[PDB]
Amino acid sequence: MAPPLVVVGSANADIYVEIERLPKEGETISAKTGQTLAGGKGANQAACGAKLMYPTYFVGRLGEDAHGKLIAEALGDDGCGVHLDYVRSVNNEPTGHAVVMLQSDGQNSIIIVGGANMKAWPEIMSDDDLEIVRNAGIVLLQREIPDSINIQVAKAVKKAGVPVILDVGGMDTPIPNELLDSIDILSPNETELSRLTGMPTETFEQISQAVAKCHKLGVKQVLVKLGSKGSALFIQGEKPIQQSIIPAAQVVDTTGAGDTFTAAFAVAMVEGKSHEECLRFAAAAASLCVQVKGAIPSMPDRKSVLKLLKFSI
Amino acid sequence: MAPPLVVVGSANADIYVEIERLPKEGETISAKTGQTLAGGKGANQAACGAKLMYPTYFVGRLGEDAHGKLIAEALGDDGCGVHLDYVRSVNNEPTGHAVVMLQSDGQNSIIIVGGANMKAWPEIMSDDDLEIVRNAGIVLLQREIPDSINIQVAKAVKKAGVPVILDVGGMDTPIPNELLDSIDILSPNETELSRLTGMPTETFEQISQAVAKCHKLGVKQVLVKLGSKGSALFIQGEKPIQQSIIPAAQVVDTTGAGDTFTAAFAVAMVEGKSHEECLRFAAAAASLCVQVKGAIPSMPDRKSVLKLLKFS
Ligand code: NA
Ligand code: NA
């Protein structure tokens, strides 16, 4: 086959509940409604690539439970078409999940259980496992699995010569410099970029400043996601490429948009498109993503993204 | 071949998370651990009956989602052996669930989602559903599905001459007297019994008067659950029969104990056992249940209960 998109990272059951207010301590309240959906930044990114019709493998750890089966079904042959050969399930850990509480004011609130995502990985990565990443055309990581696993994967691709992208989404902890040294593209949003470098990110000069610091952490390319403000690709020693959002007819649900943007950029990149085309393609995929409820259900197919591109730029 | 226990009621995914503190608006936190378990009063009582090796059907409503599969796997062929022929799944409602957030203290914050338990039932019960209850040996109800459904069931079985037990656990609203008039045995705890009578229940005598006020509105039998104090069966026209707890060597988890007690009581009763023997059977089941963490996993098989009944 063509050199595959290989995603190593998390899979979550997202437990959404609609409440009026957050419950007080010791207090029992009722929710209006609820929904449980397949998610996790890793599974999201893999679903995205598969829907865009690029050969995609997901490397992850699931529990042997209902939440785990939910994931496999959404991603697999009856869903997005992700190759699940390297997903392993354990019986001593639960599939990771997130209780997402949508209050009536408009904000969100999240409790995350690491589960298999954080606990079912081996101390040392098997060669059998590392062979898929060694055959990748491009590798995507996030920060919802252990740093140790991320580092071992990145290093295994370094000694293989193929792009490794690290989405900063996930844990709010500082990134191991050992990890930064081993990736090709860093991909943060505004807060993550700010939190990471400590520097303000309210303005483009400020953002460029924060990126300059990323360059000094050893990262040659930074793909900054600015939400409504668009995106930019910074390549050390070159002029930044900026891309505004592709406006959506209706913003229904932004869940998974960051994941969509990153995975679509990766597909465009591994297909050999120019950096400008990559940013445009990613922006169009993200634009479609936000018009449908749910992360994985909202992943657009390639022809829709290309159609939006034709008529938006 | 024996006329089945038929449980009509709720099924819930219980989502337990151990956390340091509660999150705030626009915030993400992480939990120590987390586990999602099959529960709900209807599903618990059905599981108990099946695990007691008595033919048991569960009539309930699920969502077409992972939590629905979780329930069905816990209850069905690969689990407790409940007959799930009358469980229906819908695609426009989630399986009922509760998010239980255990904080560092001992303080619990809970969110309840009614889901299909409250919203997936029909306006009028199908004749299929009413057929299984009309063919029942005994029918168990609770208050975690709409009153309308409980009433239509209770009327059908009264017609068929089938005993009905109504567990008061669930909603904290008052019980419609149309429901009270159609059930054979009402089954509250000391706290629920006080809430629907207005009277106090800290003393035995106060309980007997509240129960006297249950005979008021047409309830001929009351099975009161008293936790550590045991239980009492009040049948109007007879004298209060009692059973203290069969002492547990070690109490690990009392979740589902009331459910186990009620279902085991129903199994003993439908098997033709005497009222005294019924209470003892239920007490023994409840005793084994509290020695294991969880609700469904702690349900004892018939052999464990019958081995414990050989003792004192
Ligand atoms: Na979406
Ligand atoms: Na228990």
Curated annotation (Swiss-Prot), chain B:
The chain holds residues 68 to 378 of 379 of the full protein. Catalyzes the phosphorylation of ribose at O-5 in a reaction requiring ATP and magnesium. The resulting D-ribose-5-phosphate can then be used either for sythesis of nucleotides, histidine, and tryptophan, or as a component of the pentose phosphate pathway. Can also use xylose and fructose as carbohydrate substrates with a low efficiency. Can use GTP, and, to a lower extent, CTP and UTP as alternative phosphoryl donors. It comes from the Eukaryota. K(+) binds at residues 253, 255, 289, 292, 294, 298. GO terms for molecular function: ATP binding; metal ion binding; ribokinase activity. It is found in: Plastid, Chloroplast stroma, Chloroplast nucleoid. Its EC number is 2.7.1.15. The active site is at residue 259. Belongs to the carbohydrate kinase PfkB family. Ribokinase subfamily. Requires a divalent cation, most likely magnesium in vivo, as an electrophilic catalyst to aid phosphoryl group transfer. It is the chelate of the metal and the nucleotide that is the actual substrate. Substrate binds at residues 12-14, 40-44, 144, 259. One of its GO terms (cellular component) is chloroplast. Disruption phenotype: Abnormal accumulation of D-ribose. D-ribose hypersensitivity; normal growth except in the presence of D-ribose, which leads to chlorosis and growth inhibition. This is Ribokinase. Pathway: Carbohydrate metabolism; D-ribose degradation; D-ribose 5-phosphate from beta-D-ribopyranose: step 2/2. It catalyses: D-ribose + ATP = D-ribose 5-phosphate + ADP + H(+). Keywords: ATP-binding, Carbohydrate metabolism, Chloroplast, Kinase, Magnesium, Metal-binding, Nucleotide-binding, Plastid, Potassium, Transferase, Transit peptide. ATP binds at residues 189, 225-230, 258-259. Homodimer. Transmembrane segments: none annotated.
